[PDB]
Amino acid sequence: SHMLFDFENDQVPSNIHFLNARASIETYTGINGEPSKGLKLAMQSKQHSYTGLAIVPEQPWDWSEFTSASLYFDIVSVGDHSTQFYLDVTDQNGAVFTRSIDIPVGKMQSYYAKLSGHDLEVPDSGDVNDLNLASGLRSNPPTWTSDDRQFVWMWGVKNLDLSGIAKISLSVQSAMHDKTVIIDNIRIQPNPPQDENFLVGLVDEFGQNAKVDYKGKIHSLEELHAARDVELAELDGKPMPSRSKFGGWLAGPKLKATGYFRTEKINGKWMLVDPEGYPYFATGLDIIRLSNSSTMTGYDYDQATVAQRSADDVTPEDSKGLMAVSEKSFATRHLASPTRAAMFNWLPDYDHPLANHYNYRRSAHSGPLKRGEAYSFYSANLERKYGETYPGSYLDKWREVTVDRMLNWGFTSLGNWTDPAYYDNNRIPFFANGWVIGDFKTVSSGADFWGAMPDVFDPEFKVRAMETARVVSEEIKNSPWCVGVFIDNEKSFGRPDSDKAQYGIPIHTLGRPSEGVPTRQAFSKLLKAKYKTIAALNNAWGLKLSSWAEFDLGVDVKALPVTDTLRADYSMLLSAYADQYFKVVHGAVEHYMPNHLYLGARFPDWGMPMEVVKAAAKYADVVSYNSYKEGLPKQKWAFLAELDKPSIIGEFHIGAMDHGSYHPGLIHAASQADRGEMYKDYMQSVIDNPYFVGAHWFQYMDSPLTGRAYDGENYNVGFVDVTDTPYQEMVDAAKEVNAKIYTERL
């Protein structure tokens, strides 16, 4: 309806710019079967971590008349690899949204990204940290039916200023291979009418996509018991050959045995060493528990019947056990979200054998509900599969089968957020964790994502860190099977988008008075020692403060341009903040678990300023990073060499959309088989990096189709689906990697 680029005049448009990519116009077979001229985009994404194109018109495009329309592209990958494109669309006010999808090799398809209308109209809950759509799904089922593919929602602004679209970017990021696509028919089409029922009847009685059939979908209890029987016949509890008791490499050489997991460089490559002295390399899955397997039903209970949290609890609500819902709570049950309730084709009555799989969450990070009833279809399917030989017996069977799977699949560990009931399994090592939470004073990065940042100079922060480590130690029982302890996860230490974002903690804290703010008192002390006189600081910051006492009221550095002196100061303050965080946490872990490795705080790509990484290097035995990319690119990881610290990937994943999910997750594959190929590529990258001692995949099970209760993530990121059935493509990929982790490294 509004053609932007059909490439038929045989010219590479001059308004299109190429980032580490070569462009040409070629003839290819289009979506309708007919040859057409398209833009061939050959990205040098093996060598370069950011590649692609950007369309940047002279003056921003005015598409304000398109009140319910989408941007369309015909795209296909050529060659050996699928391509995950990030589509970023920026308006004249600098507002941006990001969508992404996999582009398979094979037949060209049409892809669309909504600009306006439909599920963009009431876009979410409002909250800036709410990345979901209004439904409480990270991405929705499409709002109409067609052969076309909808770009998946990732993050950003749902309603751009259509009167000025300034830039359209398609990029390939942190790839392990050169990617090549053909793009054609960049256009705008008004949206079809919104299907009234697009959020209705999404889920069947097994928690599966009710509207779509796919390979492996369960259609009966018989089919489920059949899948169960086939798998159980193959699981015999036997570890891969040449594994030591603790999952290490029997062939050796054997190093000094200390009785606990430890680190050591073995001929130029960092390794773990198991309690008996065998070289070790950690592989396994995160979230080996049921806590995150429930989805909001849209019902609520009258609050007099809900137990409230204890202020001294060390476990945040998201990581609590599934809450046993009482008959009296359930009787008070009432509709709070019609939209949520209508998604479910079946939910059990109080008297049904599957009614124990209800959950209640008293808080949420984001989504349409702040609290509510939830249901775990996965847990219900465990009961369906394994039945009861005594009350709760399906949970014990799930734990036994889980360990048997891990051993068959060749994993050397259970990863982070393993339920403490596995801690005495004594057949496979595990990683422990705790969270430091409590009523201690806080600071802010100015863009805190999961939660506010702790004031690590408040004595109560240390009190709570000590209680946290105490509880973990009680769980661990000083077991040699515990590889190490993660504390906290993806803290907002400062984002890399800008220098002010990066130094958000110094900027925000400097803005506050010293009185009552321990971290501000610490920052004030450091700057007094640096500058001595307020006059030196005035000239460094270009200010005219009358005294240290005025300085200590709080200073709005946020409005000042970042200069050399301000940068040096923010760097110094960030370092001191991060040093104190890691000092206190390490001290607590060491106090209660003196034998065990402390594994850091799991840095994401949006939260690893170097000042904080160097702080972790000082105190953590092993520095942890979560890295959702296609692998570990040379340039992005070159800093590791100067630190010379053993490192671990706490999280990665790849998902697909061919098994009923509305959202593949953070990194996208073309199919379950392609998921398996991409897994192998990622792990090869880890195996090849001499600083890494392991990598854990997030997570064991798919997230619920309609979103995990905590924050609406609804991804295909499991080694098993909602019916507890393994993706065999992922099993095979894991076995291939796990059979060679040691021969490769050693």
What residues line the site for Ca ion (CB under 5 A)? Answer: 6-7, 36-37, 184
Identify which of residues 37 and 167 has a Cβ nearer to Ca ion in the complex: 37
E-state strands within 94-174: 96-103, 109-114, 149-150, 152-156, 165-173
CA pair distance 468, 454, nearest whole angstrom:
14
Residue with tokens 């919104």: 194
Which positions make up the binding site for Ca(2+)? Answer: 6, 8, 36-37, 184, 353, 356, 383, 388
- The C-alpha angle with vertex 505 and arms to 502 and 507, in degrees rounded to 5, equals 85
Which residue, among 478, 473, 477, 483, has the nearest Cα to 411 in the 3D structure? 483
Q: How far is the CB of 32 from Ca ion (least distance, A)?
A: 11
Q: How far is the CB of 689 from Ca ion (least distance, A)?
A: 42
CA pair distance 369, 353, nearest whole angstrom:
27
274: its two tokens = 């198991």
Q: How far is the CB of 57 from Ca ion (least distance, A)?
A: 20
Q: How far is the CB of 180 from Ca ion (least distance, A)?
A: 17
Identify which of residues 30 and 372 has a Cβ nearer to Ca ion in the complex: 30
Identify which of residues 15 and 478 has a Cβ nearer to Ca ion in the complex: 15
Burial of 204 (0-12, 13-18, 19+ CB in 10 A): buried
63: its two tokens = 């598409």
Identify which of residues 30 and 631 has a Cβ nearer to Ca ion in the complex: 30
CA pair distance 92, 349, nearest whole angstrom:
53
Q: Is 318 helix (H, G, I), strand (E, B) or coil?
A: helix
Identify which of residues 37 and 384 has a Cβ nearer to Ca ion in the complex: 37
φ and ψ of 50, to 5 deg? -135, 115
Which positions make up the binding site for beta-D-galactose? Answer: 495, 606
Identify which of residues 37 and 464 has a Cβ nearer to Ca ion in the complex: 37
Q: How far is the CB of 53 from Ca ion (least distance, A)?
A: 16
Q: Are 158 and 120 in contact (CB under 8 A)?
A: yes
Identify which of residues 74 and 552 has a Cβ nearer to Ca ion in the complex: 74
Q: How far is the CB of 25 from Ca ion (least distance, A)?
A: 9
Burial of 189 (0-12, 13-18, 19+ CB in 10 A): middle
**DSSP code of residue 219:** -
- The C-alpha angle with vertex 582 and arms to 578 and 586, in degrees rounded to 5, equals 175
Identify which of residues 11 and 14 has a Cβ nearer to Ca ion in the complex: 11
Q: How far is the CB of 36 from Ca ion (least distance, A)?
A: 4
Which residue, among 234, 208, 229, has the nearest Cα to 219 in the 3D structure? 208
Q: How far is the CB of 5 from Ca ion (least distance, A)?
A: 8
Which residue, among 88, 83, 124, has the nearest Cα to 106 in the 3D structure? 83
Contact partners, residue 703, CB within 8 Å, separation at least 6: 292, 713, 714, 715, 717, 718
Which residue, among 531, 538, 572, has the nearest Cα to 557 in the 3D structure? 538
Q: Are 24 and 12 in contact (CB under 8 A)?
A: yes
Q: How far is the CB of 76 from Ca ion (least distance, A)?
A: 13
Residue with tokens 């073309």: 670
Which residue, among 413, 480, 432, has the nearest Cα to 738 in the 3D structure? 413
Q: How far is the CB of 8 from Ca ion (least distance, A)?
A: 5
Q: Which residue of the chain is nearest Ca ion when measured via CB?
A: 36
Q: Which helix (H) or strand (E) holds 74?
A: strand 69-77
Instruction: State which amino acid sits at residue 324.
Output: A
CA pair distance 461, 464, nearest whole angstrom:
5
Identify which of residues 53 and 722 has a Cβ nearer to Ca ion in the complex: 53
Identify which of residues 6 and 590 has a Cβ nearer to Ca ion in the complex: 6
φ and ψ of 694, to 5 deg? 170, 175
